[PDB]
Design a binder for these strands. Structure first.
Length: 324
DNA sequence: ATTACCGGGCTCTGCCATCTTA
DNA sequence: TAAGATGGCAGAGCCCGGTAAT
């Protein structure tokens, strides 16, 4: 009865909430008052609280003890109340979609038992909070899968391959083993690729390739291949290009294409680009903005060393002064 | 004095489908 | 037998500067 009214004064988007979890609006008891007071107690703003509830209404069904207990468990990982408030604003659901504080505590123990430092748990929690709402068994599967994958290739100690990969790729525990498997086979298939090279790639520059959704890597690579082929790059040149800079796989087709075109329209050859792949780091705005500045001064661009297009503001802007 | 090489910083959902559970 | 709990999916970069090399 009082529910709909309280939510209103709280500032909640009631229509959106209703549509997200209608089941919660058919409960005869709810704790929206306790929740609001609880989150206020911990620093949250009035609008954040409304936003949280609007996106994950079931939040209002937790008790002060559950909330406080779960919070205190998050405080075993993150050092301050404010850090947790920010994570909850950014995704409420990782905190509130489970009321199983025992599982949570077991997750924490299991992760520690994998040999992860607190700083690494903190990095997980802050950037992939949903790791902590996974069931223990779910996090176990991924770790097991990774060990198995580690030794299925040539890794001298899998236990340490796991830590390297989890530190470099903090999102790995919230991907399915299906997705990750498929991205590893994509890499092994498309490139060479001996286990030793595949390890390095996977632990290092290619680490987040493992988090790409189904077929998105294959599709993105296909586009890179087409686009470079069309410009007179051989397949070997294309592979070498992508392995030297796997981040290029993350770009959307159009973004990669527009980036290439915007450079070559200034007479930068494809060869200049693929031999200095880091120029593709800059956004299109930054590239266009810098190109204008440089042509707008003496510069050729066809013969210039284009590495500067991806330098820091400070280093770029200094070289530009000198150039005039 | 200037560029290259290379790794690190920041990275934090919101939905639906399919079970459990009471 | 309806909610709650859980798994799983699409989504689609940019920037900085330490330190080696020249």
């Amino acid at each position: 009865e009082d529910l709909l009214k309280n939510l209103l004064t709280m500032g909640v988007d009631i229509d959106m909430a209703r549509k997200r979890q209608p089941g919660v609006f058919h409960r005869m008891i709810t704790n929206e008052q306790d929740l609001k007071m609880f989150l206020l107690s911990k620093g949250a703003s009035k609008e954040v609280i409304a936003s949280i509830i609007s996106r994950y209404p079931r939040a209002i069904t937790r008790t002060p003890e559950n909330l406080s207990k779960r919070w205190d468990l998050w405080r075993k990982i993150v050092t301050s109340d404010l850090e947790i408030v920010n994570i909850l604003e950014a995704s409420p659901e990782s905190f509130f979609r489970s009321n199983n504080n025992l599982n949570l505590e077991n997750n924490i123990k299991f992760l520690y038992s994998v040999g992860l430092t607190r700083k690494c748990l903190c990095r997980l929690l802050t950037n992939a909070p949903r790791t902590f709402s996974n069931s223990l068994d779910l996090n176990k599967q991924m770790v097991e899968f990774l060990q198995a994958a580690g030794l299925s290739l040539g890794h001298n100690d899998p236990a340490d391959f796991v830590r390297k990969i989890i530190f470099k790729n903090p999102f790995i525990l919230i991907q399915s083993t299906k997705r990750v498997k498929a991205n590893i086979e994509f890499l092994r298939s498309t490139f060479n690729l001996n286990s030793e090279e595949l390890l390095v790639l996977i632990c290092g520059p290619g680490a987040e390739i493992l988090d790409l959704s189904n077929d998105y890597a294959r599709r993105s690579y296909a586009n890179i291949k087409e686009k470079l082929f069309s410009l007179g790059c051989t397949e070997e040149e294309v592979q070498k290009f992508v392995l030297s800079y796997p981040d290029v796989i993350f770009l959307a087709e159009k973004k990669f294409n527009d980036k290439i075109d915007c450079l070559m329209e200034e007479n930068i050859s494809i060869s200049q680009i693929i031999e200095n792949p880091r120029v593709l780091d800059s956004s299109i705005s930054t590239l266009k903005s810098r190109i204008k500045e440089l042509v707008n001064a003496g510069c050729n661009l066809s013969t210039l060393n284009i590495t500067l297009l991806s330098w820091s503001k400070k280093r770029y802007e200094a070289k530009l002064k000198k150039l005039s």
